[PDB]
Write an enzyme that holds these catalytic residues in place. Structure first.
Site, PDB file in Angstrom:
ATOM      1  N   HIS A 177      29.548  -4.655 100.090  1.00 63.22           N
ATOM      2  CA  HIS A 177      28.501  -5.681 100.202  1.00 63.22           C
ATOM      3  C   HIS A 177      27.441  -5.372  99.142  1.00 63.22           C
ATOM      4  CE1 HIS A 177      26.811  -2.683 103.090  1.00 63.22           C
ATOM      5  NE2 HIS A 177      25.632  -3.199 102.795  1.00 63.22           N
ATOM      6  N   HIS A 229      24.225  -4.300  99.017  1.00 65.91           N
ATOM      7  CA  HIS A 229      23.131  -3.346  99.070  1.00 65.91           C
ATOM      8  C   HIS A 229      23.378  -2.155  98.140  1.00 65.91           C
ATOM      9  CE1 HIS A 229      21.961  -4.821 103.371  1.00 65.91           C
ATOM     10  NE2 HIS A 229      21.275  -5.469 102.447  1.00 65.91           N
ATOM     11  N   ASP A 245      23.526   1.104  98.551  1.00 67.95           N
ATOM     12  CA  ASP A 245      24.509   2.137  98.861  1.00 67.95           C
ATOM     13  C   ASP A 245      25.945   1.691  98.566  1.00 67.95           C
ATOM     14  OD1 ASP A 245      24.066   0.311 100.977  1.00 67.95           O
ATOM     15  OD2 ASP A 245      24.614   1.743 102.551  1.00 67.95           O
ATOM     16  N   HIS A 291      26.611  -6.514 109.640  1.00 68.71           N
ATOM     17  CA  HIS A 291      25.525  -5.808 108.959  1.00 68.71           C
ATOM     18  C   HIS A 291      24.896  -6.661 107.862  1.00 68.71           C
ATOM     19  CE1 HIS A 291      23.463  -2.516 106.763  1.00 68.71           C
ATOM     20  NE2 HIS A 291      23.946  -3.116 105.691  1.00 68.71           N
ATOM     21  N   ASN A 305      17.359  -0.542 110.655  1.00 65.66           N
ATOM     22  CA  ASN A 305      17.094  -1.614 109.705  1.00 65.66           C
ATOM     23  C   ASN A 305      18.228  -2.635 109.728  1.00 65.66           C
ATOM     24  OD1 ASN A 305      18.037  -2.241 106.545  1.00 65.66           O
ATOM     25  ND2 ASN A 305      15.953  -2.904 107.092  1.00 65.66           N
TER      26      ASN A 305
HETATM   27  C1  LIG Z   1      21.669   4.386 108.103  1.00 67.30           C
HETATM   28  C2  LIG Z   1      20.722   4.302 107.201  1.00 67.30           C
HETATM   29  C3  LIG Z   1      19.438   3.535 107.498  1.00 67.30           C
HETATM   30  C4  LIG Z   1      19.494   2.061 107.091  1.00 67.30           C
HETATM   31  N1  LIG Z   1      20.306   1.859 105.894  1.00 67.30           N
HETATM   32  C5  LIG Z   1      19.917   2.070 104.648  1.00 67.30           C
HETATM   33  C6  LIG Z   1      20.995   1.752 103.831  1.00 67.30           C
HETATM   34  C7  LIG Z   1      21.079   1.812 102.317  1.00 67.30           C
HETATM   35  N2  LIG Z   1      21.974   1.373 104.614  1.00 67.30           N
HETATM   36  C8  LIG Z   1      21.560   1.429 105.859  1.00 67.30           C
HETATM   37  C9  LIG Z   1      22.458   1.037 107.024  1.00 67.30           C
HETATM   38  O1  LIG Z   1      22.045   1.044 108.229  1.00 67.30           O
HETATM   39  O2  LIG Z   1      23.632   0.679 106.742  1.00 67.30           O
HETATM   40 ZN   LIG Z   2      23.848  -2.609 103.733  1.00 68.88          ZN
HETATM   41 ZN   LIG Z   3      24.220   1.060 104.545  1.00 70.77          ZN
END
Ligand SMILES: C=CCCn1cc(C)nc1C(=O)O
Ligand SMILES: [Zn+2]
Ligand SMILES: [Zn+2]
Length: 231
Positions: free
Chosen positions: A83, A85, A87, A148, A179
């Site tokens: 996706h 984001h 990460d 998500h 989040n």
């Molecule tokens: C677990 C980490 C905290 C929230 N979060 C940040 C990111 C990049 N990705 C997430 C997520 O929840 O997938």
């Molecule tokens: Zn994400």
């Molecule tokens: Zn994430």
């Protein structure tokens, strides 16, 4: 043992062998004042490697490539981001500069553009509707529906019954949704049900962040998500 967040300084990447020709990669990154671990996948694709997701940032993704070269020694030739984001696409520019062909769905590429994140070069066709699946080398790509995020994909490795759930799947120890700014809380349980329906024999399930488990991670995530909707 599976590496944990406190064992990986930000900027370093660990590889974890799951099965023959299947690895996860684990990195760490700061987000809203704390440091979190993050998982991706590496799958042998003949004489090449298929990468699922960056290691969450340009520096981590560079360290990921170096660890792969040191430990596996096959070229990473393609990458898929599950996706939009950071990460998942953060580091795409490093992958591209290294010679990797980067891929994502049309929606992911568009949402990355809207967000101002890095944009995979190539569009994955055949994933626009809930329940769609396509073959991509040694894996199957599956769009379960919004969860998500509205674009999130999951990935199945048939040879090993490995299901990579991405950020749509929570680890067991995670009991709060945290989040969810881009999530579709109403659709998330339904999307999880499609994953369950499509991959009922998955034996190894990898969340986007944290410790792998089994199909129990799917109900666990629905429980967390529904509890968030109640209050
Ligand atoms: C677990 C980490 C905290 C929230 N979060 C940040 C990111 C990049 N990705 C997430 C997520 O929840 O997938
Ligand atoms: Zn994400
Ligand atoms: Zn994430």
């Amino acid at each position: 043992e599976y590496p944990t967040v406190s064992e990986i300084p930000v900027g370093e990447v660990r590889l974890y062998q799951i099965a023959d020709g299947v690895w996860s990669h684990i990195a760490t990154q700061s987000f809203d004042g704390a440091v979190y671990p993050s998982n991706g996948l590496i799958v042998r694709d003949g004489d090449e490697l298929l990468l699922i997701d960056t290691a969450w940032g340009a520096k981590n993704t560079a360290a990921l490539l170096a660890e792969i070269e040191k430990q596996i020694g096959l070229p990473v030739t393609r990458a898929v981001s599950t996706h939009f984001h950071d990460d998942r696409v953060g580091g795409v520019d490093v992958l591209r500069a290294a010679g990797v062909a980067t891929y994502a769905s049309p929606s992911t590429r568009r949402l990355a553009e809207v967000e101002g994140n890095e944009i995979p070069t190539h569009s994955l066709e055949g994933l626009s509707s809930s329940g769609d699946a396509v073959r991509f080398g040694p894996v199957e790509l599956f769009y379960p529906g919004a969860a998500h995020s509205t674009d999130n994909l999951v990935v199945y490795v048939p040879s090993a019954s490995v299901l990579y759930g991405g950020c749509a799947i929570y680890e067991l120890s995670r009991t709060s949704a945290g989040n969810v700014a881009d999530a579709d809380l109403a659709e998330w349980p339904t999307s999880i049900e499609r994953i369950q329906q499509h991959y009922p024999e998955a034996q190894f399930v990898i969340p986007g962040h944290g410790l792998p488990g089994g199909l129990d991670l799917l109900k666990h995530t629905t429980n967390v998500v529904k509890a968030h909707t109640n209050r």
